[PDB]
Symmetry: C3
Subunit: 173 residues, 3 copies
Amino acid sequence: MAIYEINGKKPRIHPSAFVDENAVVIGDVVLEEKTSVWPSAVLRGDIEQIYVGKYSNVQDNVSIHTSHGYPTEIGEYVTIGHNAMVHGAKVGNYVIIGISSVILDGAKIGDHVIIGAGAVVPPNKEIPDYSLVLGVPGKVVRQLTEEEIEWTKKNAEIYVELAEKHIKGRKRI
Amino acid sequence: MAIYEINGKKPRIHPSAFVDENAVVIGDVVLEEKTSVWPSAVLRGDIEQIYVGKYSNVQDNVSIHTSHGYPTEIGEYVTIGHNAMVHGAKVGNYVIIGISSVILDGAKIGDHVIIGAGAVVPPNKEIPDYSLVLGVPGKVVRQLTEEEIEWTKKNAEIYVELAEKHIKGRKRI
Amino acid sequence: MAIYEINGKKPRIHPSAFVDENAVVIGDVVLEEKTSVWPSAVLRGDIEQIYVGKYSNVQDNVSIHTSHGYPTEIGEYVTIGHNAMVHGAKVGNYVIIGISSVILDGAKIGDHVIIGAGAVVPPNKEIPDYSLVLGVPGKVVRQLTEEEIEWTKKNAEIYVELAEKHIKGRKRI
Ligand SMILES: [Ca+2]
Ligand SMILES: [Zn+2]
Ligand SMILES: [Zn+2]
Ligand SMILES: [Zn+2]
């Protein structure tokens, strides 16, 4: 992909990870196995680290950043929806970050959680496992259903396949 | 522009269409006559197709995508505002997709419609012709005025001219 | 960076300004001293001018544009948050444009002002100095505190340092 290293920090990207050449990864950024960074996404690891767990995907026009003392940590089987923005937050496993939504500094998102599209999780907000978050400021509206809890993973699995699909069949023309 | 083809699918772009080299078009994507894809926009046609009708424009940092069974179809004289995101939705003719707004899967937008900036049209939401949509979840608040109905087209026409302006006078330095 | 000139108009960029090669600057755009345009940001100066004052930063996946008669003017010590969008608005000094927020045409933002993340300042909206704006449509909710008024500047100063950090230690790999 389009990768840079800043000063001492250099990105650590597992070989099976997919990173679109139109995406931008800078500095201290960790990308685990079968992860994916899509077209025009930006992972700027120029102060605290940006860690992305396995089977996790960062969609298009998404931006990920941090603040002094607030690094961004993403768990496994996590989806970061198109045009979303995560700034110095901690996200657990099996989580869907809605499209064009915003997760702010100090935020702690639990596992098996869905954040609604366009939602804004306030700074230092703690979201319990199995929660559906909506609104601005975003808030827990109810617990996930079995079908949504199943989706919290399938969506990530779908992207693992997509990533592989681009690694092998993508071709510039 | 920055165009890729994935597996069997290759983008079909009318000669008069404008596609910024900083934009990204992937796979099964159709771009009709005098259409325009602007800087940093992303049209990822890696599962269902992304179809864009005539005199339609996809502005900067915009992302367009789909889901299995939910392809994205854009009509004519349609504006997709800066930083907006359209995912597997059907949009009619003469429509203004507001800036940083979101249109979700299964959504059916009628003709001569304006979607407010930052608005979020829920999944499978059907928006009647001549409607002004606002909020999150977005909802019809009132019918378009004659002046807005005139704007639903002029805005697209303005971009057709802009596109031509870049095709002829744009120059990298 | 990735800079283009359109027709007669060519970007005027102070030597100390930082412009990521993944960012896009087009046409009539002015970037003052120690300013910064970050990864994937877009400053399209293809109708009215886009002016950016000193110590100001335009973060990732941000889009800045204008409309006929409505040029975009950004003051000094101004932060334009990740994924935000400014369209033909006038912004004063010491202002924080929240993440994924939207500032529309005709808007007049005063000095020492903070716009909440995901907020949408309506067209022609005038925001008084020292205000905290929230919601959609965005509105003044209360006046800034001394700590926030101090932050209105520190945040910009932090980026001036960051910019310098990339200019000297950034390296593609
Ligand atoms: Ca972008
Ligand atoms: Zn930041
Ligand atoms: Zn998607
Ligand atoms: Zn525009």
